[PDB]
Amino acid sequence: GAMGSMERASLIQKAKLAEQAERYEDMAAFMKGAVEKGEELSCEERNLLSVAYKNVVGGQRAAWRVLSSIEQKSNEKGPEVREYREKVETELQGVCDTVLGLLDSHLIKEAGDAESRVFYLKMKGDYYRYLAEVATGDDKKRIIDSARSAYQEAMDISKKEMPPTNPIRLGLALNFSVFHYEIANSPEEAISLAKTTFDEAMADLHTLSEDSYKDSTLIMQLLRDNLTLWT
């Protein structure tokens, strides 16, 4: 690809320059090139990959929601709002297909510590969820099964191998809970998972360092804001 002739270390360095310059499309392209070198990513490198793609797809999701809202007002005209919505939607799908391609071709493996395996399976659930927000029909149903199945595998690993207060384990449950409520039409499962998650972590907070107490309690607060919202 376009990054094939560049050294892995140089791609990582430019990824960090792109981040400082707030050039997230460039940052994502440098990180994809790094990933395509075939070596595993460090924890710091995974987080660069994630931040880069999350900023790019986050901008497209925001634009899509602006346009989809305007589209629904003016269906209660002209084809322009729908056409431009479809154009943004196609770009968002392209990004998600890129990320899911990297996860399947390079990053999701049987080996590696639990933190990394869960990190990538969670990411897969998340990028299928972003596809599910714009999908319809039989396509949407297939996407919902793919998301569920990635999230579920990551839940299985994180119950076996991480403590209930672990921020990755907590972030995974927060995101899966959002999936249940907003995508899979399962409000009962959403509320239930978020409560179990919050409660099992509450049980261990007294036993944590002051750092861990804060990290965990930030995510616990998101779980609780969502519960307020859903009940």
């Binding site: 998340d126 972030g171 995974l172 927060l174 995101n175 809970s177 959002v178 409520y181 907003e182 995510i219 998101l222 804001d225 969502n226 919202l229 859903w230």
Partner: peptide
């Protein structure tokens, strides 16, 4: 209102 997901 949309539910919140990890950051």
């Amino acid at each position: 209102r949309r539910a919140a997901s990890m950051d």
